[PDB]
Design a protein around this ligand. Structure first.
Ligand SMILES: *C(=O)CC[C@H](NC(=O)CC[C@H](NC(=O)CCCCCCCCCCCCCCC)C(=O)O)C(=O)O
Length: 39
């Protein structure tokens, strides 16, 4: 289905950044590093 390709691609692109962050952000040192959470 189209799934509103534009908004779904935003949602995918957020998921990707939020996720690569999540695991890297974790590796950096989650909230202690003073780097934002995925959101
Ligand atoms: C970004 O700018 C695009 C829009 C943005 N997308 C996201 O935030 C990421 C996708 C989003 N993820 C979540 O919402 C995660 C939490 C899901 C909780 C679901 C609870 C039930 C919801 C019921 C909705 C009923 C709707 C009725 C009318 C059609 C996602 O998966 O949507 C964004 O703002 O979503």
């Amino acid at each position: 289905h189209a799934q509103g390709t534009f908004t779904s691609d935003l949602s995918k692109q957020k998921d990707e950044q939020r996720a690569k962050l999540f695991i890297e952000w974790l590796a950096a040192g989650g909230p202690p590093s003073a780097k934002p959470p995925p959101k």
